[PDB]
Amino acid sequence: EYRTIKEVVGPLMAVEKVSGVKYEELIEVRMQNGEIRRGQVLEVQEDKAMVQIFEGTSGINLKNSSVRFLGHPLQLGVSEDMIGRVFDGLGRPKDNGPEILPEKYLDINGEVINPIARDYPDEFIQTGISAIDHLNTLVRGQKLPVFSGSGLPHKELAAQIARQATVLDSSDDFAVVFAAIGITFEEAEFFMEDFRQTGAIDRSVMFMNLANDPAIERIATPRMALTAAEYLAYEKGMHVLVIMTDMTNYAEALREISAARREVPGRRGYPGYLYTNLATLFERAGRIRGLKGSVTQIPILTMPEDDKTHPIPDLTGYITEGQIILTRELYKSGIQPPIDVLPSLSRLKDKGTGAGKTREDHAATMNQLFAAYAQGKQAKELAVVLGESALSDIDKIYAKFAERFENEYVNQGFYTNRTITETLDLGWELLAMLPRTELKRIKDDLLDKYLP
């Protein structure tokens, strides 16, 4: 134990006479009034170590307070009993439930998967959301993020996906790890209450970190959640869906720590190592050869000023296999969920679709719906520019198609769970508006089988 506090600058403190102290090591501060606060080493030299106190430094007298180094960093106590439980960012119980006796304690950084040990995503995941399942299909082992924005309903979409996501057949279902990073209590309570009211909590492990929690707890949260996921998946053989919001809050926490170490920012004010950081998190996912279990990731982030060139969504897209984009234009028009299919993409979609996986008319109808939607939007624009005089009869149909596509297909509601069959069938009912001559991307083989 050390009575050697040298400096206190905000929530930071410098401690001298250190030895055997490691980066990210946990500390414990005994104040002059006996009060106990914990912290973490952010930087360490021969003579001293810099620490940040979770609870802050208000009321601390340097001379009469003491510091103890715990000899270990933050660690997760893993067990299959985590299922059905709610924890905070540091893995501490939040639901006032029974005590958990850990199988073992794990470091939360994980290990990098050998690129040749990974198996390719194979199994279709039915989210119950048409604009995803059909046009931007999620496959087991993929990382497919939602790019949103302030005031957009990624909260409701996250809850919906966690609620409805399932694999056809299998019998064994999805264990869902849900990480909330730097969110408001009101949003955290929405998630927790939705999970309880639907019974989804029985399938889930939740790690809830709030906006007024320390920056170091926000940074720990995704790592705690992913450590839990890899344990359930790669050690217990479970299929795990990992949903994490808001990744932008995670990035802002990094900047705070980076500034405390006086590091010069990279592009747009973020650490130079932001890519490495995001890549280390998002690549903790996928199937592994010879293993039964898997990790599927859906990171969720808000794009600052709705800017896709911003470092956070820009670097994330380089790492993840596509992205689902929410837009203000669709939301203002009352489309729920407001998914814009044109810039949205799933890069592994061709791997989870077709006969045996979904249905044989999956790929063809997807390309056809996409083409007609873009063509219909062009037709609407034409009518505004040149008038209704310039529209042909085919043009007026495409315009009507795009209208119905947004309002009946994309706009399904945040509590509507569509089976892939229902989604594909609705696609055909919309394509039925068009003459058979217009359905070019569909072979007459499947056009004669499904077209109403």
Binding site: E305, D306, D307, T309, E381, L382, V385, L386, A390
Partner: protein, 43 residues
């Protein structure tokens, strides 16, 4: 004035303006051809 929000918005106005220019140019051409038929009859 020169913010990233303005940039993205002006880039959008350019795409629209470019398309509108093409549509209007096609309209003028279509009107011109119909005019050619009528003006010969007028003559």
């Amino acid at each position: 004035n020169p913010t990233r929000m303005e940039l993205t918005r002006l880039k959008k106005q350019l795409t629209t303006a470019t398309r509108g220019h093409k549509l209007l140019k096609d309209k003028q051409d279509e009107l011109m051809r119909q005019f050619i038929l009528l003006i010969r009859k007028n003559n």
